[PDB]
Amino acid sequence: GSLAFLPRKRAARHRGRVKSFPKDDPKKPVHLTAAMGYKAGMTTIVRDLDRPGAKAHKKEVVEAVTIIDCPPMVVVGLVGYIETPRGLRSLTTVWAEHLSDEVKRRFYKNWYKSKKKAFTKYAKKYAENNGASITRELERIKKYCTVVRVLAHTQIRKTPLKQKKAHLMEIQINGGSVADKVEFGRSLFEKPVTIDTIFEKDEMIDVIAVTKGHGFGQMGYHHRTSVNHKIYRIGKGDDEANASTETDLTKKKITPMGGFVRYGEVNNDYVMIKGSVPGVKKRIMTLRKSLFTHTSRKALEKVELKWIDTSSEFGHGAFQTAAEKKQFMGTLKKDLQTS
């Protein structure tokens, strides 16, 4: 194979790390770089293609897309880094009040038998007029640091999973002075940030994941950073018509009939992204921005959807809604016996 990915080895961590944030300049506005989500599955769409010069121009093309459930992330920290002859060094970090039970479970390994004593002294530091110490750390980040990141964690309690341990990571703030970005993070403390705010529709981004193990030497469980994937839609979860387009007036959600196979139902903000993505269903995904400005027309295209498949994934299914199934079918022995 490729000597770039060889010696082949298991990923040291299940989450997957960014390893490179986009280069930052003060002129751009203040923004976050990356995000987290959980792979729910894949569905089929069609697109009123508007690609000039292509054989399928002004035609309808069937494409496969992937769904990543993206519950809002909670900001719980702010990390300040400095430049040294040995590289970047994490000078300091500042945590917030009221760390959630899920991020505390992330810190703990045996959470059930532990006395849950984490960050209690930090909370006392914040609340007991050691805000002088908190502001001292903040001003140290203000005047000594060059690149600033925000600690953020997901909501497992909102993701329909048997897990209860959240995933914490650093998302870098770009586009501004160090003072502006530290103030931005301190303002973002104890607040949910949304995927429709970190990314938008029609934006080729990068997905970082760990490949599916192919065991029962190493095949799979390999850290990959797949680039250039066009986000096709950002769904609101509470819109009740996420899967609806302007061409079909069907009030339906992104979740297929009977639910996603082995994952469940997507009731949160979700991202519909073109193509395939590394990782199995319900695996943690990392969504970041492209390190460079794009060079293709495919990046500037506008995706006009026509309809989204909500048929059953558990087999050869053919009805988008239970209402459609019962209209096609009529009434049954069970329905008349119950009624």
Partner: protein
Amino acid sequence: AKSARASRIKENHQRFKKNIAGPVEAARLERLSAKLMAIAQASGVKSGKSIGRKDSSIVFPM
């Protein structure tokens, strides 16, 4: 065919980055930054303004 690392190809990509993708990404960045900014705004020693000390080696121990 010209390689992906060709100088002329890189110059063409730089021109494309400067002329179209630049403005488009700047506009989207402005919109997302405005949204996230809205979501955000949704004595020295005992005050913290004076940054002091908290709480192997580089020099030879004397």
